[PDB]
Amino acid sequence: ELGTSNLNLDARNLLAYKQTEDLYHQLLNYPQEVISIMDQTIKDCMVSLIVDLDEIETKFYKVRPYNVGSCKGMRELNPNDIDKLINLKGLVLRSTPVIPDMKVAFFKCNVCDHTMAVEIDRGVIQEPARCERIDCNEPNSMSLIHNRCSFADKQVIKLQETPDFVPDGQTPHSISLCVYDELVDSCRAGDRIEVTGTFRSIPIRANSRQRVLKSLYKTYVDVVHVKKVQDLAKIREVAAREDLYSLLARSIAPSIYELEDVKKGILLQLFGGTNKTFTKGGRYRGDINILLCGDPSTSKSQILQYVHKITPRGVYTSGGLTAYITRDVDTKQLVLESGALVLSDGGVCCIDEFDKMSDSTRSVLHEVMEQQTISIAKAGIITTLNARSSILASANPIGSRYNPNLPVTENIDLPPPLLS
């Protein structure tokens, strides 16, 4: 009734049956053949159960087995476990662009403009030495066409072990990963995932000019499974409560004692104002910016962390924050990277230790609040970027205490206009 093509399959339920545990063990030994015959069986089972036959002949069927065995780490991988199913947990380090993979060749007899399709296997292609048309039958008239073939999307993922496997301050190890089709782009940088797949080994070409091969084989894992690590009616019931303001203000900071007014202000600025861009006058700022000052005995960083994690979008930084052209590390190319302030579009940008802000970056803030659009002109790139972000900062007075007699300006050491 859905039209999709996807099956989930747990091993423990597969293990609960006495005949199936034999199939369990045989799946452990021979993954590829078992998976292929299982997919063929499901392809037959669809038709066996529907007894529209038109949507079936277009789609394929695949399984996604999981929980076959306990998760193993890169620190214990014997060569005895080659071509067997294992489960891994780890953190994604880096991804790669989609790699086209040859599946069907397309040749053409240039003399007679005749084309034929040739299948391949194991990557190696058996080139035909003569055109099939015996009317011409020339041997050297066959030429490959690159852009009229069929391809598959291969992608390589780099994975690192979880830090819990290193008890004595050793360094983590990295294992390469491979994915196909629906598994492409399913993980990004910093993602914590668990995968299920078979093990593999491959020879190294060494010198590309000759046919010499190294005595050591590189190891990589091919996977078939990944996992990560009407409510509006309830809103209006709460929205009709008279004292919702006080409860909502006090809910943000459960451990903070008193300080009710600042909590109300922070909640209200989290709510945010309106934004309008009428043509004849120009846009008006809708962001709210708040500054906190006091001696370092107020737990004012706890409120910063509270607002950072509560808000949908927001970056928590300290005293670089904007876009700058960078030289890519692993690949020798030039990439434009956006800063922390740009990343907080529509959210709350949290700044800690605002006094030690240097001098070059402060003017940047003087540019980002009054116009909410930062421009850059470096390396031949001239452009303007939108920020539209809210600022919430904390500052400390100069000295062990803030003397009430002295006015605020001297103690914080900030420019009068920026405070204004």
């Binding site: 880096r94 852009n147 990004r188 120009g282 031949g380 790139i381």
Partner: protein, 636 residues
């Protein structure tokens, strides 16, 4: 020998037939008066009368022709059916305009696609299919010629073999038609017989909008060809329309020349004749055919239209243009009439003249605005940035090393030795809007008064010397020392700027705030009304488009001076020099020849505003009044 007839791809012939059919007889109607347009026939007429080579086809106009039996058939297998479309286009053109062929590379660009894809959604199943993508261009390359159709000479018999189609490698022929010869030797390329085409490679990446979290942006390589070169400048967000292709590694392929990444595991393919024992890899690249971006008075009169004639004639023939004109500048702000008039005069500008021996005369107006905090001084800056073309907004303290004028940057042990352009350099032929003038530093503080008067910037550092053009019209704002303007003192006493900088400016405006109960209520009411009630319903006498039309019409006039104008001007200059020098010695020095030149420039600008080729001494009197009230203010 056998001469076997080639296979006829009838599908290509059928799609070509349908293509030429809806090319010849589209026959769409645009408006009521446009009964039959024949838009593509008119396009061919345009190529006749202007010698053009590219044609533009709308996808929507193609969409309703034969439904998906033709539109989808072309879009999906675009590479498959491209030569058939080329043949059909050549057939119809040589049916309707043989002399246009004088044999030439016709190009077709499809536009207005239903949807656009993100870079992260690019997948291999769409190879050879028409597509549209968007991103930020970050780098381009030089416009290099590209071999398209090569002609070859068989050296031992000097026979001619031509029309050899090329591929991703430089290909020589494989046979010689001469019966006595058998092409044992290779060929010599005939450069003067081959035909080349333009080629430029650009790089694009995902916008900051699409990219999630802190991951790195995805990059792609786009190749342009034909008339679409230099159309995507770095830093611009653009939309590309073209066909997905794939490029192999030519290094493994046979060539006359000599031959993250270390982990390998690439999809290598081996087993061919020419590869030997080498493996072939591939990479995704995009081919583009259409690029668009989403981010003399007689010449002006040539752009003729009913509104162009009527509106401009009405504006010229009116009697109270000036009275209305100043009322139409920055309708959002409240009050400050003279600041509006001054900004209008700055935006008109003055005539630029050069002497007979090569001495340049400054032809621009510089204006400074001084006032106590919060009296709506940055609003004028923002409005003039948003209205005046080629304008740049800049803060007084610049975070970059370029600062205001320029700077020299070199790579560590790198042979760059290149300059970077400051805001003044970018603002060429435009208006530079610096804010918070007070806290400039010494280098900029001494470079500005050379950039202003002489309109050039000169530098000589670390083996590179240059003289950059900085023809700009500056407008600046500042705040008095101590926060509030002290009426007791003068401009020099309150401001911290140096005396030479003050002489550079041509006009000054001082605006103050007060605690009067009658003014602040009106100010608050006007702010509230624009905020909620009439956020779009302001009442300016003239619209922005009319303002721009009149400004561009008035900019095409160069006023002159008459005898009475010269006599009145010299009398006024003598009076202004005399009366100020009567005050005190060694304490008042503010009038130089620059003031006379400023009078001339302001009179020329006022004459331009009224669209008069001559100058009346009333304009001189008005300019003198402005410059004198610039000194009335410093007294009060």
């Amino acid at each position: 020998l056998n001469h076997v007839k080639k296979v006829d791809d009838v599908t290509g012939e059928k799609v070509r037939e349908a293509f030429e059919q809806f090319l010849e007889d589209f026959s769409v109607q645009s408006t009521d008066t446009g009964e039959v347009e024949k838009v593509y026939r008119a396009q061919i007429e345009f190529m006749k009368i202007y010698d053009l080579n590219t044609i533009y086809i709308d996808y929507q106009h193609l969409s309703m022709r034969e439904n998906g039996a033709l539109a989808m058939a072309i879009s999906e297998q675009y590479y498959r059916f491209l030569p058939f479309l080329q043949k059909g286009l050549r057939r119809v053109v040589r049916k309707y305009a043989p002399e246009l062929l004088n044999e030439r590379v016709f190009q077709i660009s499809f536009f207005n696609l239903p949807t656009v894809h993100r870079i992260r959604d690019i997948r291999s199943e769409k190879i050879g299919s028409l597509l549209s993508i968007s991103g930020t261009v970050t780098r381009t390359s030089e416009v290099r010629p590209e071999l398209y159709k090569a002609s070859f000479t068989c050296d031992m018999c000097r026979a001619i073999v031509d029309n050899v189609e090329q591929s991703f490698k430089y290909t020589e022929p494989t046979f010689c038609p001469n019966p006595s010869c058998e092409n044992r030797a290779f060929w010599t390329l005939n450069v003067t017989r081959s035909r080349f085409l333009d080629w430029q490679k650009v790089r694009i990446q995902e916008n900051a909008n699409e990219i999630p979290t802190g991951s790195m942006p995805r990059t792609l390589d786009v190749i342009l060809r034909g008339d679409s070169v230099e159309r995507a400048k770095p830093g611009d967000r653009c939309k590309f329309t073209g066909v997905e292709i794939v490029v192999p590694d030519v290094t493994q392929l046979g060539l006359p020349g000599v031959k993250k990444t270390t982990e390998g595991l690439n999809s290598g393919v081996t087993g061919l004749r020419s590869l030997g024992v080498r493996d072939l890899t591939y990479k995704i690249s995009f081919l583009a055919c259409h690029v668009i971006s989403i981010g003399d008075q007689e010449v002006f009169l040539n752009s003729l239209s009913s509104d162009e004639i009527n509106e401009l004639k009405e504006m010229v023939k009116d009697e109270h243009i000036y009275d209305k004109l100043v009322r139409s500048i920055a309708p959002a702000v409240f009050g400050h009439e003279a600041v509006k008039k001054g900004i209008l005069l700055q935006m008109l500008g003055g005539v630029h003249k050069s002497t007979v021996e090569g001495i340049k005369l400054r032809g621009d107006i510089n204006i400074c605005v001084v006032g106590d905090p919060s009296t709506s001084k940055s609003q004028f800056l923002k409005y003039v940035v948003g209205f005046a073309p080629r304008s740049v907004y800049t803060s007084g303290k610049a975070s970059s090393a370029a600062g205001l004028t320029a700077a020299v940057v070199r790579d560590e042990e790198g042979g760059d030795y290149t300059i970077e352009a400051g805001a003044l350099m970018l603002a060429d032929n435009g208006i530079c809007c610096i804010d918070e003038f007070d806290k400039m530093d010494i280098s900029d503080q001494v470079a500005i008064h050379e950039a202003m008067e002489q309109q050039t910037i000169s530098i000589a550092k670390a083996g590179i010397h240059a003289t950059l053009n900085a023809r700009t019209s500056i407008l600046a704002a500042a705040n008095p020392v101590g926060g509030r303007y002290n009426r007791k003192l003068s401009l020099r006493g309150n401001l911290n700027m140096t005396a030479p900088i003050m002489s550079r400016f041509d006009l000054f405006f001082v605006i103050l705030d007060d605690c009067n109960e009658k003014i602040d209520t009106e100010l608050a009411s006007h702010i509230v009304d624009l905020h909620m009630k009439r956020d779009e319903a302001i009442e300016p006498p003239f619209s922005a488009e009319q303002l721009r039309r009149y400004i561009k019409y008035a900019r095409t006039f160069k006023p002159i001076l008459t005898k009475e104008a010269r006599s009145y001007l010299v009398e006024k200059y003598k009076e202004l020099r005399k009366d100020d020098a009567q005050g005190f010695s060694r304490s008042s020095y503010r009038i130089t020849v620059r003031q006379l030149e400023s009078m001339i420039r302001l009179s020329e600008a006022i004459a331009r505003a009224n669209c008069v080729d001559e100058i009346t001494p009333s304009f001189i009197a008005e300019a003198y009044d402005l410059l004198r009230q610039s000194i009335i203010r410093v007294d009060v």
